[PDB]
C-alpha cells in the first residue's frame, strides 16, 4: 500500500511542478550550432566541453583547421535574468541511420520561473549569431544557350559606396528599388505586372555596369549576366531566359547599343507569359540610338543620367585612396584637379591613383601629368 502510493505521489507532485517548470527539447534540427555556441559565449566559466574539428582541405595543399567548442555530455547550471537554470544533455541507445550512425541527442533546459518570456530572448540571441557570422555572396548567372548556369564562384559583394556617383543619384535608386521589393501586394491586387525596368545611360566607362554589380550585394540579391552581343541569341531565346531566371535575381544587359529586332523585343521586355519577381537592368553607352517609345512607363520606369566626374566624386575618391586624413587634405587635391583639367572620366581617376599608391601628398603635387 505504502510502496504503491510513493511512486504515484512523486509523479503527481511533478505535474504541479510542471506548470511551474519550463521544458524545451530540440532533436538535431540544425539549431544546435547556434544555441551551443551561445552557451559557451554566455557562460565564460564552463568545465565539461567537447571538441569539434573542421577540416577545410581546400584543393591547394592548404588545410585550414579551427576549433568550435561546445559543452560535452553531462549537466550544467547557468545564471540568467531569472533564477538558476538546470541544463542537461543526455544520449540514448537508439541510432540515426540518416547521416552518420550517432546516438539520438536531446538537450533539456529546466527553469524555475513561470514566464515563457525568458527563452524567447535566448532563442532570438541565437539568430543574431548565425547571420552575423556568415556573410552573403552574390551568385552570378550566365545564359548557356537557352538555360542559365553558375559562372565561377559566388563573388564577394562589392560595397555600394565603392561606385561614387553624383550626390542623390545613389540614394534615389536605392529608395526606388527598396520600395519595389517590400511591396509585392500593391501589384497583383491592381492587375499590374510585377516587373520593374531600369535604364542607365552615359559616356563609356562612367560606372553603369559597375554600379549594378554593387547594388545586388546591398539588397542581398543575385545577378543574371546577359550580354546583348552574343551570336546564338535570337528573339525566342530571350523570352525563355527571362522566364527561367532564379528568384531574387537581377538581369543585367551590357552595351545595348551594339545589338535582334525592335518589334520582337516587346514581349521580351513586358511579357504577360513570364515569371514574377523579375528585375531587369539596361546599360547603354549611347542613348542616341533608342526609340522614344522604348522608355515610356511600362518598359522603363526610371530614366537616369550618368555623367563624368564632378567635384563631389573627386573629393570622395581622394578619401577612399587616402583614409584617416583630415577633411582639409581632401580639398587641395580637388582644387587643382578641376583647375588643371577641363574634362576627366571616372576610368581615368581610378588609374591615376595607381601611380601614387600610399602617397597622398604625391597625388596633389603631380596633377599636371593628366594633360
Ligand X SMILES: Nc1ncnc2c1ncn2[C@@H]1O[C@H](COP(=O)(O)OP(=O)(O)O)[C@@H](O)[C@H]1O
Q: Which residues bind ligand X (CB under 6 A)?
A: 163-165, 191, 193, 204-210, 272, 283, 285, 346-347, 350
50 marked as binding residue: no
- Rule CB under 8 A: say whether 159 interacts with a copy of itself: yes
Nearer to a copy of itself, 142 or 341 (CB): 142
Of 12-71, binders to a copy of itself (CB under 8 A) are none
- Rule CB under 8 A: say whether 291 interacts with a copy of itself: no
263 marked as binding residue: no
CB 176 within 8 A of CB 183: no
Nearer to ligand X, 34 or 352 (CB): 352
Question: Which residue of this chain has its Cβ atom nearest to ligand X in the complex?
Answer: 207
- Give me the phi and psi of 100, to 5 degrees please: -140, 0
Smallest gap from Cβ 143 to a copy of itself, in A, equals: 12
- Give me the phi and psi of 156, to 5 degrees please: -75, 135
Place of cell 577540416: 55
Cα–Cα distance measured from residue 301 to residue 217, given in angstroms and rounded to the nearest whole number: 22
- Rule CB under 5 A: say whether 209 interacts with Mg ion: yes
362 marked as binding residue: no
Count other C-beta atoms under 10 Å from residue 49's C-beta.
11
Number of alpha carbons in the 13 Å side-chain half-sphere of residue 187:
15
206 marked as binding residue: yes
Question: What 3-state DSSP class applies to 346?
Answer: helix
CB 298 within 8 A of CB 272: no
Contact pattern for a copy of itself over residues 180 through 219, marking x by CB under 8 A = --------xxxx-----------------xx--x------
191 marked as binding residue: no
* Dihedral of the alpha carbons of 70, 72, 73, 76, in degrees to the nearest 10: -80
Nearer to Mg ion, 222 or 285 (CB): 285
Question: How much is the CA Rg of the chain, to the nearest whole Å?
Answer: 30
- Rule CB under 8 A: say whether 98 interacts with a copy of itself: no
Nearer to ligand X, 20 or 192 (CB): 192
Strands (DSSP E) found in 84-150: 85-95, 103-111, 137-138, 140-144, 147-150
Nearer to ligand X, 27 or 192 (CB): 192
* Ordered DSSP codes for 28-90: SSS-HHHHHHHHHHHHS--S-EEEEE--EE-TTS-EE--EEEEEPSEEEEE--SSS-EEEEEE
Smallest gap from Cβ 124 to ligand X, in A, equals: 39
Partner from ligand X, Mg ion, a copy of itself, none contacting 165, C-beta within 5 to 8 A by type: ligand X
Partner from a copy of itself, Mg ion, ligand X, none contacting 271, C-beta within 5 to 8 A by type: none
CB 311 within 8 A of CB 337: no
Strand partners, 304: 200
Smallest gap from Cβ 315 to a copy of itself, in A, equals: 23
Contacts of 113 (CB under 8 A, 6+ apart): 22, 82, 83
Question: Candidates 10-18, 68-76, 155-163, 232-240 — which segment interacts with a copy of itself by CB under 8 A?
Answer: 155-163
Smallest gap from Cβ 169 to a copy of itself, in A, equals: 16
- Rule CB under 5 A: say whether 213 interacts with Mg ion: no
Cα–Cα distance measured from residue 300 to residue 197, given in angstroms and rounded to the nearest whole number: 4
- Give me the phi and psi of 303, to 5 degrees please: -95, 135
* Dihedral of the alpha carbons of 24, 71, 44, 54, in degrees to the nearest 10: -120
303 marked as binding residue: no
Q: How many residues bind Mg ion (CB under 5 A)?
A: 1
Partner from a copy of itself, Mg ion, ligand X, none contacting 39, C-beta within 5 to 8 A by type: none
208 marked as binding residue: yes
Partner from a copy of itself, ligand X, Mg ion, none contacting 111, C-beta within 5 to 8 A by type: none
Annotated binding site for ATP: 202-209
Contact residues for Mg ion, defined by CB under 5 A: 209
Contact residues for a copy of itself, defined by CB under 8 A: 140, 142, 151-153, 155-156, 158-159, 162-163, 188-191, 209-210, 213, 225, 272-277, 297-298, 351, 354-355
Amino acid at each position: 500500500l505504502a510502496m504503491a502510493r510513493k511512486g504515484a505521489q512523486l509523479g503527481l507532485v511533478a505535474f504541479r511542478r510542471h506548470y511551474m517548470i519550463t521544458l524545451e527539447v530540440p532533436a538535431r534540427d540544425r539549431s544546435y550550432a547556434w544555441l551551443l555556441s551561445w552557451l559557451t559565449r554566455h557562460s565564460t566559466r564552463t568545465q565539461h566541453l567537447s571538441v569539434e574539428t573542421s577540416y577545410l582541405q581546400h584543393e591547394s595543399g592548404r588545410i585550414s583547421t579551427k576549433f568550435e567548442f561546445i559543452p560535452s555530455p553531462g549537466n550544467h547550471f547557468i545564471w540568467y535574468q531569472g533564477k538558476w537554470i538546470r541544463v542537461e544533455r543526455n544520449r540514448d541507445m537508439q541510432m540515426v541511420d540518416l547521416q552518420t550512425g550517432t546516438p539520438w541527442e536531446s538537450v533539456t533546459f529546466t527553469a524555475l520561473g513561470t514566464d515563457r518570456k525568458v527563452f524567447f530572448n535566448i532563442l532570438e540571441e541565437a539568430r543574431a549569431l548565425a547571420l552575423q557570422q556568415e556573410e552573403g555572396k552574390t551568385v552570378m548567372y550566365t545564359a548557356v544557350g537557352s538555360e542559365w548556369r553558375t559562372f565561377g564562384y559566388p563573388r564577394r559583394r562589392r560595397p555600394l559606396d565603392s561606385v561614387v556617383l553624383q550626390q542623390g543619384l545613389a540614394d534615389r535608386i536605392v529608395k526606388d528599388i527598396r520600395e519595389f521589393i517590400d511591396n509585392p501586394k500593391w501589384y497583383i491586387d491592381r492587375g499590374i505586372p510585377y516587373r520593374r525596368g531600369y535604364l542607365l545611360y552615359g559616356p563609356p566607362g562612367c560606372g553603369k555596369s559597375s554600379f549594378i554589380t554593387a547594388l545586388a550585394g546591398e539588397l542581398e540579391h543575385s545577378i543574371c549576366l546577359l550580354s546583348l552581343t552574343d551570336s546564338s541569341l535570337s528573339d525566342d531565346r530571350l523570352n525563355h531566359l527571362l522566364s527561367v531566371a532564379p528568384q531574387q535575381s537581377l538581369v543585367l544587359l551590357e552595351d545595348v547599343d551594339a545589338a535582334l529586332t525592335f518589334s520582337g523585343l516587346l514581349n521580351a521586355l513586358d511579357g504577360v507569359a513570364s515569371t514574377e519577381a523579375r528585375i531587369v537592368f539596361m546599360t547603354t553607352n549611347y542613348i542616341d540610338r533608342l526609340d522614344p517609345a522604348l522608355i515610356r512607363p511600362g518598359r522603363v520606369d526610371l530614366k537616369e543620367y550618368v555623367g563624368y566626374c564632378s567635384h563631389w566624386q573627386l573629393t570622395q575618391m581622394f578619401q577612399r585612396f587616402y583614409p584617416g586624413q583630415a577633411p582639409s587634405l581632401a580639398e587641395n587635391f580637388a582644387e587643382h584637379v578641376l583647375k588643371a583639367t577641363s574634362e576627366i572620366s571616372p576610368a581615368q581617376v581610378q588609374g591615376y591613383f595607381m601611380l601614387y599608391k600610399n602617397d597622398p601628398m604625391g597625388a596633389v603635387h603631380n596633377i599636371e601629368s593628366l594633360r
